[PDB]
Amino acid sequence: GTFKAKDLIVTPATILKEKPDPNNLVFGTVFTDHMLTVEWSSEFGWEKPHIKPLQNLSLHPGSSALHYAVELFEGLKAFRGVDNKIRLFQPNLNMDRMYRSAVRATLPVFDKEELLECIQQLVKLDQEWVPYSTSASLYIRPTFIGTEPSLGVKKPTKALLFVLLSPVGPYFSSGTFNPVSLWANPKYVRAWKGGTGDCKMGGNYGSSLFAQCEAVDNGCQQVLWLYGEDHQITEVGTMNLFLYWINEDGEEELATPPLDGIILPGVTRRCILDLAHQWGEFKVSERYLTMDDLTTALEGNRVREMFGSGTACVVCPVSDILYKGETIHIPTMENGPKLASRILSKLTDIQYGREERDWTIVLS
Amino acid sequence: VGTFKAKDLIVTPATILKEKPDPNNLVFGTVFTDHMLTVEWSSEFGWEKPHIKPLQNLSLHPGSSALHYAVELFEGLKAFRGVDNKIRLFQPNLNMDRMYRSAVRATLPVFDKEELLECIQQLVKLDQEWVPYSTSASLYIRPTFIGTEPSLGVKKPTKALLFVLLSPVGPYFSSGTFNPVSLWANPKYVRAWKGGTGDCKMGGNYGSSLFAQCEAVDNGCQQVLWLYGEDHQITEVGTMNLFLYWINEDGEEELATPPLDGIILPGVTRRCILDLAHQWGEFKVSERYLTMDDLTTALEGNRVREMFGSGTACVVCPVSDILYKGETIHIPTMENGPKLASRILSKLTDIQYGREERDWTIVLS
Ligand SMILES: COc1cc(C#N)c(Oc2ccccc2C)cc1-n1c(=O)cc(C(F)(F)F)[nH]c1=O
Ligand SMILES: COc1cc(C#N)c(Oc2ccccc2C)cc1-n1c(=O)cc(C(F)(F)F)[nH]c1=O
Ligand SMILES: *Cc1c(COP(=O)(O)O)cnc(C)c1O
Ligand SMILES: *Cc1c(COP(=O)(O)O)cnc(C)c1O
Ligand SMILES: [Mg+2]
Numbered sequence: 062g063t064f065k066a067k068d069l070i071v072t073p074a075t076i077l078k079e080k081p082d083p084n085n086l087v088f089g090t091v092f093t094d095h096m097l098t099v100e101w102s103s104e105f106g107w108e109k110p111h112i113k114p115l116q117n118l119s120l121h122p123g124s125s126a127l128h129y130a131v132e133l134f135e136g137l138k139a140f141r142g143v144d145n146k147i148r149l150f151q152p153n154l155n156m157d158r159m160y161r162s163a164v165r166a167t168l169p170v171f172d173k174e175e176l177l178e179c180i181q182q183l184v185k186l187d188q189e190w191v192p193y194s195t196s197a198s199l200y201i202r203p204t205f206i207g208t209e210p211s212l213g214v215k216k217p218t219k220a221l222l223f224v225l226l227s228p229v230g231p232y233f234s235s236g237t238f239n240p241v242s243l244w245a246n247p248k249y250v251r252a253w254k255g256g257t258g259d260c261k262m263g264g265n266y267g268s269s270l271f272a273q274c275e276a277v278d279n280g281c282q283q284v285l286w287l288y289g290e291d292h293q294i295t296e297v298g299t300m301n302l303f304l305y306w307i308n309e310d311g312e313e314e315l316a317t318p319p320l321d322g323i324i325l326p327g328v329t330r331r332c333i334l335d336l337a338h339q340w341g342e343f344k345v346s347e348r349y350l351t352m353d354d355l356t357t358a359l360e361g362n363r364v365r366e367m368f369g370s371g372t373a374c375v376v377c378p379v380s381d382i383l384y385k386g387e388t389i390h391i392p393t394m395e396n397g398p399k400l401a402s403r404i405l406s407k408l409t410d411i412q413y414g415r416e417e418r419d420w421t422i423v424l425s
Numbered sequence: 426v427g428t429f430k431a432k433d434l435i436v437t438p439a440t441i442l443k444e445k446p447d448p449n450n451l452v453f454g455t456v457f458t459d460h461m462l463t464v465e466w467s468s469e470f471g472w473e474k475p476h477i478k479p480l481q482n483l484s485l486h487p488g489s490s491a492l493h494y495a496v497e498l499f500e501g502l503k504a505f506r507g508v509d510n511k512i513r514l515f516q517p518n519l520n521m522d523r524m525y526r527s528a529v530r531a532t533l534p535v536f537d538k539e540e541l542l543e544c545i546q547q548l549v550k551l552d553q554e555w556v557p558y559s560t561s562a563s564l565y566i567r568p569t570f571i572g573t574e575p576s577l578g579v580k581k582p583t584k585a586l587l588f589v590l591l592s593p594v595g596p597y598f599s600s601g602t603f604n605p606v607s608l609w610a611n612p613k614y615v616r617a618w619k620g621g622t623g624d625c626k627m628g629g630n631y632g633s634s635l636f637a638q639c640e641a642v643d644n645g646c647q648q649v650l651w652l653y654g655e656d657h658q659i660t661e662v663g664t665m666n667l668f669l670y671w672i673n674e675d676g677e678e679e680l681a682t683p684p685l686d687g688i689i690l691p692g693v694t695r696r697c698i699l700d701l702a703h704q705w706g707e708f709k710v711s712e713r714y715l716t717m718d719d720l721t722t723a724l725e726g727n728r729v730r731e732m733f734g735s736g737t738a739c740v741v742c743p744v745s746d747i748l749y750k751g752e753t754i755h756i757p758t759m760e761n762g763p764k765l766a767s768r769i770l771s772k773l774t775d776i777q778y779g780r781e782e783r784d785w786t787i788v789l790s
Contacts, residue, residue, distance in 0.1 A: 266494035
């Protein structure tokens with residue numbers, strides 16, 4: 062079986078909370094009035110979906126989510142356009158990616174069309190939480206947990222699928238660009254060949270916290286995740302990594318690591334490669350990039366810009382990488398940053414409906 | 426930093442008691458006792474007083490970091506009702522040690538190991554009639570530690586809960602004897618990597634394994650043989666450590682197990698077996714790399730005697746077969762006694778059930 066949006070039971074909150082200051086926002090700390098919940102059991106399958114007041118979950122302390130990280134999540138955004146139509150951005154890709162993660166977690170499958178419809182009804186009810194700001198958005202957090210009251214390492218026979226909404230302001234409180242410093246220690250690895258690094262499964266992030274703490278203790282805002290003997294640069298924290306440079310053949314190139322199973326195939330990532338290919342003003346390469354490739358390129362003044370991209374931060378310029386004690390300067394902000402800005406402009410124009418696109422859907 | 430103290434334990438006993446299960450009919454980790462331990466932590470005030478209270482649901486904010494970013498770890502140790510009807514813990518200080526190290530690596534707050542162990546004893550004491558009346562059953566102790574930070578921010582939690590569940594579990598196998606396991610060996614999946622958390626009981630290590638185990642069962646196998654690297658190193662038999670008893674390449678009688686290089690869980694059983702092996706001094710004992718090629722080369726030379734798993738789950742679990750590159754590879758474990766596997770099971774079980782005294786066991790308070 063599968064749950065249907067048609068069967069939605071709606072319990073509106075009787076008291077509505079004060080909306081947050083659209084600038085004065087700590088990320089994922091403010092929650093809207095309503096949540097979606099759908100119960101699943103092996104015995105009866107999917108219960109009817111519920112839109113109800115944000116509340117605590119009552120979970121058996123043996124729930125597999127708390128013991129064996131039988132859990133996954135998504136992140137997508139709703140944007141209030143210049144025309145004051147609320148839009149989702151490639152939401153079908155987030156549904157697709159969430160379904161694949163469920164199968165790989167052995168959580169029960171669901172109808173992707175129906176979840177997306179339930180998400181729209183939730184956003185619609187809470188639409189005034191979609192900020193009145195051209196640099197803020199509503200974060201949508203679909204979450205899926207095993208609630209199997211059993212310590213047996215097994216496919217769960219009980220689960221909960223729920224969706225939270227959280228209004229998130231501009232990544233940096235100037236709303237322009239505040240370049241990130243990166244901590245690069247090969248001692249830690251986010252993901253590996255034959256792992257789950259290409260899925261948003263909770264286990265990928267729990268092992269990262271110690272590295273992020275270590276980043277903050279050496280001044281940096283994010284981890285540069287290194288992989289393999291040659292120290293490949295994979296991901297800028299929770300974001301895909303782009304390098305804009307003169308390559309080894311002396312060519313202008315936008316370069317990003319390939320989707321080889323250790324990389325999260327970000328929606329932003331694919332969009333930026335599409336844009337880059339469409340413009341055809343420089344070479345676009347899904348290729349391996351090492352710290353040696355980077356420092357060799359830096360000594361030749363061949364590096365122009367480095368930036369992260371994810372739902373978190375559409376474009377996040379990198380200014381510095383801490384590596385083997387020394388601080389390595391990336392001249393991103395000294396070069397405009399021309400490409401980073403052109404990309405942020407185009408994605409933002411699309412997200413906020415300043416131009417039409419296949420990538421956006423107007424809210425039901 | 427600080428710690429909760431056992432001296433400050435607030436006890437709320439259940440007014441209504443659940444019926445104990447048949448010791449001969451126990452499904453693993455499915456039955457729970459009457460009481461649980463809970464201790465709240467905040468970065469603002471530190472550790473609250475510890476509570477022993479009726480088993481209940483946890484009330485968690487749906488933004489709790491445990492549910493989103495696997496900010497969670499656990500332990501597993503057993504209480505055994507001995508032949509003398511004294512309840513014993515087995516190496517519980519090693520479980521506390523491993524749980525402290527996991528906490529640090531998860532960025533959860535540290536606690537006093539002595540104090541947790543004392544609180545666990547008070548919980549088991551209260552619920553001691555749940556420790557089964559059976560020489561092949563036990564009480565499973567599940568210390569669990571979760572981030573409850575109501576924030577989607579990927580960060581160190583400023584709110585956490587440490588709780589302990591008790592669950593009476595029967596023998597690993599219905600028969601109560603050796604039922605040799607078939608192993609599914611697919612290099613497509615990797616449990617753990619260098620610079621990962623595979624040497625900790627952090628929840629993230631286990632979630633990725635379920636799909637592999639389902640695939641194991643779908644090809645008739647009972648467990649996954651976890652392979653690592655281009656040489657296909659044999660690391661772990663499911664959630665158990667892996668031992669190989671054989672004539673090595675130098676023609677020496679050897680007990681071999683993968684080294685603690687960061688991808689292996691340092692099991693309490695593993696530690697105990699290496700100590701026993703070293704103490705007996707009857708053969709070479711090597712923490713070394715073992716590949717499928719090392720194994721099949723040794724099999725073609727009739728150099729393999731026994732292969733077995735070890736964990737709290739299954740003290741000793743003989744391996745009969747490995748499915749690898751579409752063929753079924755026979756391990757002559759059961760054709761060789763299994764003499765070593767039996768000697769180990771005898772010793773650990775005699776200790777767990779108080780049939781002999783040792784430094785490894787502690788009598789319940
Ligand atoms: C403003 O920061 C963020 C905004 C968003 C959004 N939307 C975000 O989305 C995610 C993407 C992947 C997995 C989980 C999440 C919550 C992450 C962050 N974020 C963190 O949560 C944590 C750090 C770190 F620096 F602490 F690592 N960095 C960060 O960008
Ligand atoms: C009775 O079975 C078990 C008993 C115990 C104990 N005590 C155990 O200990 C653990 C060790 C590491 C993480 C989690 C646990 C619960 C595992 C299993 N167990 C499973 O739960 C599942 C399979 C499976 F691979 F077959 F699925 N194997 C198994 O040993
Ligand atoms: C979420 C995430 C990204 C970005 O993917 P988007 O779909 O663009 O948000 C990148 N890397 C990791 C590790 C992530 O978790
Ligand atoms: C728990 C566990 C073991 C066994 O360790 P013990 O402390 O002896 O129970 C082995 N491998 C993994 C992956 C484990 O989680
Ligand atoms: Mg349909």
